[PDB]
Design a protein around this nucleic acid. Sequence first.
DNA 1: TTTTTTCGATCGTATGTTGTAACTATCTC
DNA 2: GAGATAGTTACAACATACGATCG
Lengths: 366, 366, 321, 365, 343
Amino acid sequence: MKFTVEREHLLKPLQQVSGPLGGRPTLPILGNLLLQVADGTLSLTGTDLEMEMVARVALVQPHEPGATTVPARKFFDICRGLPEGAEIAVQLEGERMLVRSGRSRFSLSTLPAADFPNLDDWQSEVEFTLPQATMKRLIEATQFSMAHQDVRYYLNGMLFETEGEELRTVATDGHRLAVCSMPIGQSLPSHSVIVPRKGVIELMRMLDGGDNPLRVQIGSNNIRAHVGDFIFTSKLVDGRFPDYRRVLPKNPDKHLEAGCDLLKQAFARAAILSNEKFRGVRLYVSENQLKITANNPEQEEAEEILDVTYSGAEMEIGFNVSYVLDVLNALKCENVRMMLTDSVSSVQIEDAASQSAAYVVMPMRL
Amino acid sequence: MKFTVEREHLLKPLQQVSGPLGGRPTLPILGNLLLQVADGTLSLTGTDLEMEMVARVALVQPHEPGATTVPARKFFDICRGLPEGAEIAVQLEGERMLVRSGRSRFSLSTLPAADFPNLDDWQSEVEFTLPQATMKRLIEATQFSMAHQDVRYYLNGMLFETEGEELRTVATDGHRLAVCSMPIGQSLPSHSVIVPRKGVIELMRMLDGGDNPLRVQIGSNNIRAHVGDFIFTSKLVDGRFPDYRRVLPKNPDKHLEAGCDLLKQAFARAAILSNEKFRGVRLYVSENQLKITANNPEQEEAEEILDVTYSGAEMEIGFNVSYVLDVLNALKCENVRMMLTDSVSSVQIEDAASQSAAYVVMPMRL
Amino acid sequence: SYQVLARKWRPQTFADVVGQEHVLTALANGLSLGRIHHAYLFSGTRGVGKTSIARLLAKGLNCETGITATPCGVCDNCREIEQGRFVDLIEIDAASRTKVEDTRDLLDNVQYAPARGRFKVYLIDEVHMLSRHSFNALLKTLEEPPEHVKFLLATTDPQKLPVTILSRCLQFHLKALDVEQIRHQLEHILNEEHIAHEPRALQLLARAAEGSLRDALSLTDQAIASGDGQVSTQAVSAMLGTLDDDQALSLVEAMVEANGERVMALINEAAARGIEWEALLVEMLGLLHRIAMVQLSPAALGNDMAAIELRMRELARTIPP
Amino acid sequence: SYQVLARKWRPQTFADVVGQEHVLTALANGLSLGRIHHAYLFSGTRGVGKTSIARLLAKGLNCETGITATPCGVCDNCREIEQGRFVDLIEIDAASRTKVEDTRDLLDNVQYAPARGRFKVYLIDEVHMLSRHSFNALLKTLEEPPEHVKFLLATTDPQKLPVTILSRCLQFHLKALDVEQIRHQLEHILNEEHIAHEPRALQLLARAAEGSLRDALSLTDQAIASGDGQVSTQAVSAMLGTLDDDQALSLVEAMVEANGERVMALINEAAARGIEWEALLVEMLGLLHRIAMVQLSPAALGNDMAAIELRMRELARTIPPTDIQLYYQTLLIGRKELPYAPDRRMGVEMTLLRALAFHPRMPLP
Amino acid sequence: MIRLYPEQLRAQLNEGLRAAYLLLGNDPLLLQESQDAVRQVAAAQGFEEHHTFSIDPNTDWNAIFSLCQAMSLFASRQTLLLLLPENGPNAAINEQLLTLTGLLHDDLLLIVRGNKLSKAQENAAWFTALANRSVQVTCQTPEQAQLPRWVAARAKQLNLELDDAANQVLCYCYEGNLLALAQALERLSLLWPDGKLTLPRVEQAVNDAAHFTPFHWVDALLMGKSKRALHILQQLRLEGSEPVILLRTLQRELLLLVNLKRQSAHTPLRALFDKHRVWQNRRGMMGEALNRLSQTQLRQAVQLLTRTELTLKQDYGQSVWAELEGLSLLLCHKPLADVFIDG
DNA sequence: TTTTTTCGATCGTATGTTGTAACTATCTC
DNA sequence: GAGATAGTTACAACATACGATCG
Ligand SMILES: Nc1ncnc2c1ncn2[C@@H]1O[C@H](COP(=O)(O)OP(=O)(O)O)[C@@H](O)[C@H]1O
Ligand SMILES: Nc1ncnc2c1ncn2[C@@H]1O[C@H](COP(=O)(O)OP(=O)(O)O)[C@@H](O)[C@H]1O
Ligand code: ALF
Ligand code: ALF
Ligand SMILES: [Mg+2]
Ligand SMILES: [Mg+2]
Ligand SMILES: [Zn+2]
Ligand SMILES: [Zn+2]
C-alpha cells in the first residue's frame, strides 16, 4: 500500500477537512479522519456526526485498495514539520502505518476503519446541477434573513424548494421575509426541504468563484453537494415551514417607486441619530413626497425629505431602519418598488426591473 | 450664533481635531468640540485635559458671533454623510444646534461654552521657526529608541534641546540611546525640555509634507506649535532627563567601517534562521572577517561568515538582534561606521558620510 | 375591545388615589412649600399604587402651570405623561436594565438639559433587581445630582438594597388597603361602568383581594366574565366563595354536641352538593380559630361575618378553650 | 428654592466637623509638623464624613497661604476646591470607572506637574470597586509616588482592597457618631434654618439615625415635609411608626408581658406592612435564642444588635430561663405547624395565643 | 543558607551583603520592613535600578531573563524582586527558577518574597543550590503570648511610654494584625507628641480589627475562655468565613476527645497520646479539656454538630452561627438547658 | 516538625485571543 | 490617472477565570 504524496497537493485539502474538526473530540475516533484509496483516487473524509466533508485527490502511481483512520492533529503536525516541497511515502504495515520522510521513519497508530461513522449507500430523491454563480447569488440574497436562536426551531434555517424548473430560497425570522426564485432549466418534482444555519454557512464558505458547476442531491433525510473535488453532506431539520405566499400581502393598493441609491443614503443619514437599541424611524408618504423622521433617547431629532413617484393617500408608517438598509443593500439595484396597504400592514419591497426576488418587512406598532 | 460653510472645507479640520478625542472622557464636556464664530472666523477646539488642538476656518458668508459645544462623533458623521459639494448652515436656537443641508435638517444637543475648560495662558520662553523637513527627520531619527512603557516616566518621552543654532533630539530606553542634530539657522538661548510620546506622535501626524513653516514656542511647562491654520498645545513632562554626553564614549580606540546594506541583510538572514526567541547573537570580528552565530542552546550553529574592511585586533561580542536590526533599519544608507573601546563598553554607530545621527548601544553581558 | 379595568381606572390625580393619605399629604406639603428632594423611594406590597403615585408626582413637577400639588391634567405635558409620551420622563426597566453598562450610559447622559419640561425625571422601576455595580455607580450621582434632575425609585423588596442607597433617599412605605376602601372603590368603578352588582359579591371580592387593589380588579373582571355581564353573589361564590357556607358551622356544632348521626347526614348532603373536602376542612379550622380569638378578645369578630356573629359568640361562652 | 440639608450644610473647616476628634487632631498635627504621608485611606460607616474630611484635607494641602491645618477658606484655591473647579484637584469616581483603561489614563497624567497648586491631589472615592489590574496599576503608582502628588482614598469596606494597598497607605477609621452629637447638630441646623422643633422629636430622629448623620438629615427633611414646615413630635412619631421594622421584638415583649391586645395590634400592623409570616416567626425564634444566650453569658451580643441591645439585655435579666425555653418550644411547634394552617396569619395568631396562654403538656416516658 | 529573623537583619546588612535574599512568611508588615531595609542598604551600596515582578505562569520569563542578561546603558548593580504565588511554586516555576539561578551574577541582586514554603516546596534543586550563598528570613506572626513583648519592643523603638494596660488593650484589639498595630502606634504618637500613652488615650483611639483562624477558635474552646471564643466566632463571621471549615475543624478534635475519654478508663493518658500522635505542646491542653468535662458532655455536642450540619445542608438555613455559639457555650462549663439540643 | 470545605443551577464583570469585514496605500497597467 | 491586489485596523464573537445568591 505505497502512497506517494506531494506537500503542495496535500496542503489545502488537509486544512479544508480539518476545518470542521475541533479541539473537543467527544469520541475516540471522531477526531481521526478516514483515508481510503479507490481505483486511482484517494479520499480523505472527516465528520462530527452532524456534517461530513470528503476531499478526493487523483493518484497516478500504482496502488491497491485500502482504508484506514489517522488522527488529524498528528498528521497535520507531521505535514507542517516537513520542509516545503518534500515527498511523503505512506505504507500500511500491520496496525501502525509507516511514514518515510527522507531517512526519517515514523510509526503512526491506526484504528480500524469499519468503526468510522461514514455513510455507505446514498439514495437521491432529487438531484440536479447548477453553476456556482446562481447558488452563490441565491445564498447571498437569502442568508441575512435567517433567525439565529429562536424557540421556533423550523425558523432557524433556509427553505429550499424545487418546483417545475424553478429553485426558490426562503428565509424568515418572524419579523422579515426574503424570497428568491431562479430558473434552472431542468424539470424537477415539487419538493421542499429545510437546511440549518451550519449547512448553509459551510456551503457558502466552501463555495468559491464560479469555475465548475456543483451538483446537489437531496434524499429523505440528507443533502449532499459535490463541487470540484469536495463533497459536503448535511442533515435536515424536518420541522415543516410556513408558506411564504401567505405572508406576502394580498392586493397592495399603494405603490411607490424610488431610486435605490437616494433611499439608501437618506436612510443611512437618518440612522445617525436613530435609537441605538431599537433603530426606529417614521416614514410619512404623501403625493410625490417621502419624509423620514428619526428620534433619539437623548431627545435628538433628524428629518429628511425626498421626492418619489407616489399618488395615493397620505400614510404614516413606523419601521426598523436596520432591516430596510439591509434589504436595500442586498437588493443592489437602481429602482426600488415598495408596495403597502395600510399603516398596520407588512410592506413588500421589489425591483422595478424584475421580480426575481422579493422582501417583506412588518412595521413596528407603537 | 449662525454660519454657513462647505463640507469640503470643514471636513479636514474635523478629522484633524477629532483624532485624539475618543473613548469615554473623564468629563462629558471633554467629549464635545468647542465651536466659536467671531471676527469672521470659525475656531474649532478639542482638548483632552493635557493636549489641545485648534483649527481656524475663514468665513465668506453672513454670520453672527457666538460660541457653543457639539459632540465630536455625531457632528463628524453628519458632516461626512452629506453629499459631496453640499453646503452646511449651522444655527444656535435655545439650547440646541440646528444644521441644514439643502432639504435635510438635523438637531443636536449642546452644552454651555463657559464650562468648557480653558488652558491657562502662558508666556513663551523660546520662540522660533523651523522647516517641516528638518523636524520630520529629527522625529524619524529619534522615535524608535523611546520606551513605549517604562516605570521611569521621564524616559517615556524624548528630549528636545536648543543650543545656539542647533536643535537636538535625544531618545533612550535604558539600553540604547539615539541622538540627532540639525542646524536651526538662528541664535537662540540654550534650553532643554521633555516631550511625551503622545505629543510627538500628534506633532508628527500634524505634518503633511507641505512647505508651510512651523512656528515653535516653548514656555515654562508647555509647548505650542503653529502649522498653517492649526495650533497644537501640549504639556511638558516634569523630570530630570539623564545626560547623554556622559554616556557617549570619550575616545573609542577601535573603529570599523562597513557596508550598511551588507550588515542589514546579514542580520536579517540570521534572524530568519534564528526565528527562535531568547538569547542573542555572538559576532566575532577579525582582520577583514566577521562571523555571526546564533546563541541558541541546542539549535544547530548555522554561523555566517562575511567580509568587512577591518584590520584591528580580533574580538567577540554578543548583541541583541532586535536592537542592531532597528539601528540598521533606521539609519538607511550604504555605509556605516562603528566605534568601540573594549569588550565591556558601549558601541557607537553612525553614518560614514555624516555624524548628525548617532546610536550607542550597550553590549549584551555574557 | 374593552380595555382592562386596572389599566383604564388608573388614578390621574391625587384625588383619585384610594388611601395612602400620609404619603399624599407629605408630597402635597413638599410641593406647596417648595422643599423638593432629589431622591424619592417608594416601597410596599403589590398593587398599592407606587407607580401611580410616581406618575402623579412626575405630572406635578412638570406642569406648564408651575410646580403645583394639584396638576391641571389638561396641559399638553400632563396629556403626554398620561399617554406615556412625555420626552422628559425617562422610565427605566431595572428588571431588564440590570447590567452596569446601562447605568453607566444613563449617568453619562444625565448632564444635558431637558427638552421642554423644567425637570428630567428618571423613574426607575423594580430597582431592587440592579446589581451592586449599578448601585455603586448611582451613589455619587444621587449624592450631588444636577439641579434639573430628579430620581424616583419604586420596589417591592427594599430590604436587599444597599444601606447607602437607602440613606441617600426619602423613603415612603405604602400600607395595604383595608377591606372597606377596596369595597368602596369596586362599587364606584362598577357604578361608573354601569354593571349590576350585589353587596355580598363586593364583600367577598374585597375579602379575597387581600390588600392588593389590582387583585380586586382582576377578581372583579373574572366575576363579570363568569356572570355574563353581571356581578352576582352566586357567580362570585362559584369561583371564589365555594367556601363560607352554613354547612361548616353546622358540622362544627354537631361535632361539639357529639351528634354522630347529624354529622353523617351533613357529610352526605355535602357530598351530594359536590363540596371540596379540603375546603371544608379549611373552613372548619377557620371557624374554630375565630371562636378561639373571640374567647381571647371579644372584638376579634368583625362585621365581615356578622350574619353568624351571635351563634359564634354562643360557641365562645360554652366550649372551654 | 430650598436646598437639601445634607447638600446645603457641608463641613468647610475642621471646626465644623462633628466628632471624629482623633482623626482631625492627627491630621492637624501632621500638617503642622510637615509629616505628610504619600497616601491616606479613610474608612467607616455611611454618613460619617469620609468625603468631607478628604475635601477639607485637599483644601488644606493646596491653600495659597501655606500648608495649614485649618484652611483659610477665602483664597481662590479654597473656593475653587469647594466648588469642585480647582485645576489640580481630581475627583475620580471609581464606581463608574472600574475599567483599567479609565484608571490608566489618570495614572499616566500623574506624571505632569501641577499647574497651580503645590500638590496634584488625586481623590479616589469608592476605591473598593476597582478591578484587579486597576489595583495593580495603583500599587505601582503608590510604589513610585512623585513628591508633588498625593492620594486620598475613601471606602466603606476596606476589606476588599488588597493588603498591599493597605500597607502602603495610612488608615483612618471614623467612628459612628453618638446620639448626643447628632441631636446637637440637628438642633443647630434647625436653629440656623429658623424652623420650630421639639426636644422629643430631635431625640427620636437621633435614635432613628443609628449613627449616620446623613440619615438624620434625611429624616429631618421628611419630618419637615410631613409637619408643614414644623418638626413636631407627632409627625416624627407617625413617620417612625410607618417605617418601624422592630415589630418582632415588640411581639416578643408583648408575649412576655401576656398582653393580648398589644399582640393583636402588632399583628395587625405587620399585616398592613405585608411582612412575611414565616420570616416573622424565624426572627422571633432567633431573638428568643439570643436572649437565652445572653442569659447564659452577657458576651452573646456584639455590635450586630447594638440597635436593640438594651431591650434584649433587659428581657434577658427579667425573664426566667424556663419561660424562655417554653416560649421557644411553642414557637418552634408553631413554625412546624404553619404550612398546614389555612392561613399563615392564622397560624401565627394561633402560635402566639398558644404561647401566651396554652402551656404544652410535656410528653411522659 | 544563613537563617535569620527580621530583628537581626540590620546588623547582617551592615556587616555585608549577599548574593541573594529570601523572605518567606505570613505577616505583611515584617516582610515589607525587611524588603525596605534590604533595598535601602543596596541603594546605599550603589544599587540604583529596581524591578519587581509577580511570579505567575501567565507572566513571561523571557523578559526577566533578558533583563538579567542585559546591561543597563548608564547603570549597574540592578535589583530584581520576585513575588511568589500564594499557593506556592509549581514544577514549571521550579524549572524557571533553576534556569534563573544560573543567570545570577554579582551585580544582580535577587529578592524573593512570598508565603512560607512547605516541606515539599522547600525541597527544590534551585533552593538547595542557592542555599550555599543565600540568606533566609523567618517571618512568623507572633502568638498571643509573644505579642506583648513585640508591642513593648515597638513602643521602645519609637520612644513611646506604653503602660501594661495599654499594651494589653492593643494586643486584644489588633490581635493577629501587626500592620494595624504599627499604624495605631503611629497615630497615637502623632496625637500626643509628649508620648505619654495612658490607658484612656489608647482606649479612645482604638478600633477592633483582630484577625483569627478556626484553629484559634478550637483552641479557645478547649481552654474554656467563653469570652475569647465568642469574640473569635464574631470576628470570623464578620470577615465572611464559611462555617463548613469551622465545623470540620471542630469535628476532628471532638471525635478525638470522645475516643480518648472512652478509652481513658483503661489506659494511661500518655500511652493514648503516644498512640494517637498528638503534638507535645497540645498534650496539656488536651488533658485539661478531658478532665474538665465528662461523658455527659461531648455526647450532646455530637448531636448539636449533626443537627447543625443537617440544617446547613438539607434545609440551607441561615441560623448556623447561633448554633455555633450555642455549641461553643456548651463546650464551656455552662448549663445549656438542652431544649435547643433537641435530644 | 502542621493539620486542604456541601453541591447544583443561574447571573454578572472584566480581560485576552482569533477570525472576518471594511478601509487605505502602493504598484503596474 | 485609475483599478486591482495586498496589508492594516476595528468590531464582533468565543473562551477563561473569579465572585455572589438561592435552593
Ligand atoms: N391607591 C390606588 N387607588 C386607585 N387605584 C389603584 C391604587 N393603587 C393601585 N391601583 C390600581 O392598581 C393597578 C396597578 O397598580 P400599580 O401601578 O401596579 O401599583 P404598584 O406599582 O404598587 O404595583 C393600577 O392600574 C390602578 O388602577
Ligand atoms: N462628621 C461630620 N460632621 C458634620 N456633618 C457630617 C459628618 N459626617 C457626615 N456629615 C454630613 O453628611 C453629608 C454627606 O456626607 P458623606 O460625603 O456621605 O460622608 P461619607 O463619605 O462618610 O458617606 C454631608 O453633607 C455632611 O453634612
Ligand atoms: F408594579 Al408593582 F408592586 F409596583 F406590581
Ligand atoms: F458618601 Al458615603 F459612605 F455615603 F462615603
Ligand atoms: Mg408598579
Ligand atoms: Mg462620601
Ligand atoms: Zn398640566
Ligand atoms: Zn485658602
